[PDB]
Design a binder for this molecule. Structure first.
Ligand SMILES: NC(=O)c1ncn([C@@H]2O[C@H](COP(=O)(O)O)[C@@H](O)[C@H]2O)c1N
Length: 240
């Protein structure tokens, strides 16, 4: 069918639900309680929660106990990300019972570890590809980490189940999705692709939904929901 999955985002820094611009540290706008934000999305009919520990992604401590409390409060599917770079952080992340985790920096820095984790955990693992042009970025998007196509080829052959694709130039900007990049990634894999960053309107969600036949499975939405560009109910109606 034509349905696009919607994943409202809760990104956590210093115990707060925040949004960044280009994922730059220091551009936080705070939106209150991460737990109340997640409960509100769930109450409005969310099927998914995209939950991110940004302190862990930046290496400035973590919010592990709070993240765990938020995930325990969800009856819906949970996608968990942020600082998952070794066995201990992966163990705690999966212990939330989350539907899947996203690995970002680890795919660039420890490709052998990511290959091992894919083989042992299957589609509980997705890899986040955060892109500037055709260059991948890591460590909270503070450093380069490789070429998009070479990395996709490697992860394809390692059996990676799913990719989360962010154009860093769109992220947090309300400037719309990068539909060319999404289609370019769909051309390079037969794995489901989740779009992330830039959504600003219901027309943006409809345009991403137009790529479902090409292999786009879902869209993560952050700033536009916190900014009340539309309600989650309106977004769910638009993507059904
Ligand atoms: N600067 C940022 O906003 C940022 N840096 C990383 N992340 C998210 O955190 C994850 C990557 O963390 P790590 O690089 O530890 O795997 C990815 O899913 C990515 O969307 C961000 N939102």
């Amino acid at each position: 069918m034509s349905k696009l999955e919607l994943l409202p985002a809760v990104d956590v820094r210093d115990g707060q639900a925040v949004r960044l611009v280009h994922g730059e540290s220091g551009t936080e706008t705070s939106y209150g309680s991460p737990l109340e934000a997640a409960l509100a999305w769930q109450r409005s009919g969310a099927e998914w929660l995209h939950l991110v520990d940004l302190d862990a992604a930046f290496g400035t401590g973590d919010n592990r106990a709070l993240i765990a409390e938020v995930a325990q409060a969800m009856d819906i599917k949970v996608e968990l990300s942020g600082g998952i770079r070794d066995d201990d952080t992966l163990a705690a992340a999966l212990a939330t019972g989350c539907t899947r985790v996203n690995l970002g920096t680890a795919a660039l820095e420890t490709p052998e570890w990511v290959a091992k984790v894919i083989a042992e955990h299957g589609d509980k693992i997705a890899v986040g590809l955060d892109v500037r042009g055709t260059t991948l970025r890591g460590r909270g998007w503070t450093r380069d980490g490789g070429d998009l196509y070479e990395t996709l080829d490697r992860l394809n052959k390692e059996g990676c189940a799913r990719y989360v694709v962010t154009d860093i130039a769109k992220d947090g900007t309300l400037q719309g999705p990068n539909l060319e990049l999404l289609k370019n990634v769909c051309a390079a894999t037969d794995r489901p692709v989740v779009a992330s960053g830039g959504v600003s309107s219901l027309d943006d969600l409809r345009a991403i939904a137009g790529l479902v036949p090409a292999g786009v499975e879902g869209a993560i939405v952050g700033k536009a929901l916190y900014a009340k560009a539309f309600t989650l109910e309106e977004a769910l109606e638009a993507t059904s």
